[PDB]
């Protein structure tokens, strides 16, 4: 199937409570493989998956150095952005960055990403062309000007089309046992009477990997998108995910409803109904 590699970074200032806390994590699809926390006992790029443990200490030293340089750049940038937004130095602020690449089943680049947010709002983002920027406001246009002067986009494009795709390919091979295994959902429908004249049908999906899934309810073969309650896909803690979709139905019409399940571990979409 298709795969993704992403690095996530969060810096949170805490005036009066020391320097900003920095946490970064790396993922291949929905598997975390590295983490670095500035407030850990021994901050380092820590391998979190068996398949990455083979890279060796020199690799971890290099990755650790990159993490520490980014924590330092973020401390400088949190001060800069107080100036750009004319803010008090007293408040807590957050800087986030995500970057990475998506590849198709042939390992070819589908899309590259590099984007930043300040206080949870878009700040500056590399466009899909990997050559232009979307600056959210006039402060981010100052950064855009610096980055267009330093030819940042060109350097990013070369990483995203090169090392990003090559290393994701290497990790997918080294971790093929897990990264390249899709665990289909275990599915069932439960029934819960609401009143004398209505009941809830809840379609469950458990134990699936990756997280991407579609659960839909049809009434007489028509999608019930507007009337379906969908919970956010949630982690089980054993690598797998869970999700449910529910509909409120007139009592006695249960067999007119069908739950449809799409997941990459399924060879074909699955159809299920309330059985008893």
């Amino acid at each position: 199937g298709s795969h993704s590699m992403r690095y996530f970074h969060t810096s949170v200032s805490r005036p009066g409570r020391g320097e900003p806390r920095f946490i970064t994590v790396g993922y291949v699809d929905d598997t975390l493989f590295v983490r670095f926390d500035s407030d850990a006992a021994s901050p380092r790029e820590e391998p979190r998956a068996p398949w990455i443990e083979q890279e060796g200490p020199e690799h971890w030293d290099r990755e650790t150095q990159i993490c520490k340089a980014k924590a330092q750049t973020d401390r400088e940038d949190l001060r800069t952005l107080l100036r750009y937004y004319n803010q008090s130095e007293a408040g807590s602020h957050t800087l986030q960055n995500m970057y990475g690449c998506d590849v198709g089943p042939d390992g070819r680049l589908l899309r590259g990403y590099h984007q930043d947010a300040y206080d949870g709002k878009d700040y500056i983002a590399l466009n899909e062309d990997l050559s232009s920027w979307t600056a959210a406001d006039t402060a981010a246009q100052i950064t855009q000007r610096k980055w267009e002067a330093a030819r940042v986009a060109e350097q990013l494009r070369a990483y995203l089309e090169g090392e990003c795709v090559e290393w994701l390919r290497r990790y997918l091979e080294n971790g093929k046992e897990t990264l390249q295994r899709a665990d289909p959902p275990k599915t069932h429908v439960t029934h819960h009477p609401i009143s004398d004249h209505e009941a809830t049908l809840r379609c469950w999906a458990l134990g699936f990997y990756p997280a991407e899934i579609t659960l839909t309810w049809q009434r007489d073969g028509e999608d019930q998108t507007q009337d379906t309650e969908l919970v956010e896909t949630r982690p089980a803690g054993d690598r797998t995910f869970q999700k449910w979709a529910a509909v409120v139905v007139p009592s006695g019409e249960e067999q007119r409803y069908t739950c449809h399940v799409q997941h990459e571990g399924l060879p074909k979409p699955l159809t299920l109904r309330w059985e008893p």
Binding site: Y7, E45, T73, E76, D77, D116, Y123, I124, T143, L156
Partner: peptide, 10 residues
Amino acid sequence: KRWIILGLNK
């Protein structure tokens, strides 16, 4: 593998 850059200040 992380991306390494200099001059990335905002």
